[PDB]
């Protein structure tokens, strides 16, 4: 993808945001991979929207890209697991443990074992190393702090965290410039559409 094409995506990102096409904005961020919206990410983490959190992340990194991303996905999936235990849904917890958390066992067996063991506790805060889990809201917040640090230090995100400074409606301004250019070609000069060049017979 060109540097032109990349800048065009940013212009479109601005336009979509100004038009309040919110889901479209974040899909473009994700699919282009050009910009990671930390504000959006914090919002989805605070809301515990783990499926979207991972889907969004997938546009930027895979679990085994490097140690930062591994810990990012591990922390997220661990929190998802802990929340399942907290609502006393052990069936879902085991599902999470096997589907989502097992990939980390290779990289740390004893950690995966200790997390597995939480399944059999009446309240998983009985484990002194898991006794620091407060409630869901605080747990998400303290983890989000770590997630932000990890993402900001993750080399895969290094030029993707700050939106370019642009004047508002930059794409619309360029479009208007296009229409000026088209009209400037006419003689004798007296707009139907953006779809075809304008003309004055």
């Amino acid at each position: 993808m060109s540097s032109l094409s990349r800048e065009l995506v940013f212009l479109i990102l601005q336009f979509l945001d100004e038009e309040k096409f919110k889901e479209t904005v974040h899909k473009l961020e994700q699919e282009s991979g050009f910009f990671f919206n930390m504000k959006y990410f914090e919002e989805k983490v605070h809301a515990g929207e783990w499926d979207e959190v991972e889907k969004y992340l997938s546009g930027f990194t895979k679990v085994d890209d490097n140690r930062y991303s591994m810990k990012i996905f591990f922390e997220i999936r661990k929190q998802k697991y802990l929340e399942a235990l907290d609502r006393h849904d052990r069936a879902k917890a085991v599902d999470i443990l096997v589907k989502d958390l097992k990939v980390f066992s290779t990289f740390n067996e004893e950690a995966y074992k200790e997390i597995t063991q939480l399944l059999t506790l009446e309240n998983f805060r009985e484990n002194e190393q898991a006794s620091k889990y407060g409630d869901t809201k605080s747990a998400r917040s303290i983890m989000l702090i770590e997630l932000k640090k990890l993402i900001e230090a993750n080399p895969l995100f290094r030029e993707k965290l700050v939106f370019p400074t642009l004047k508002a409606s930059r794409l619309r301004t360029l479009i208007n410039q296009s229409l000026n250019w088209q009209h400037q070609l006419c003689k004798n000069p007296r707009i139907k559409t953006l779809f075809t060049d304008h003309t004055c017979t």
Binding site: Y68, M70, K71, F107, A111, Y112, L150
Partner: peptide, 7 residues
């Protein structure tokens, strides 16, 4: 504990 840490 699956843990890289950072500064």
């Amino acid at each position: 504990d699956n843990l890289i840490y950072l500064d």
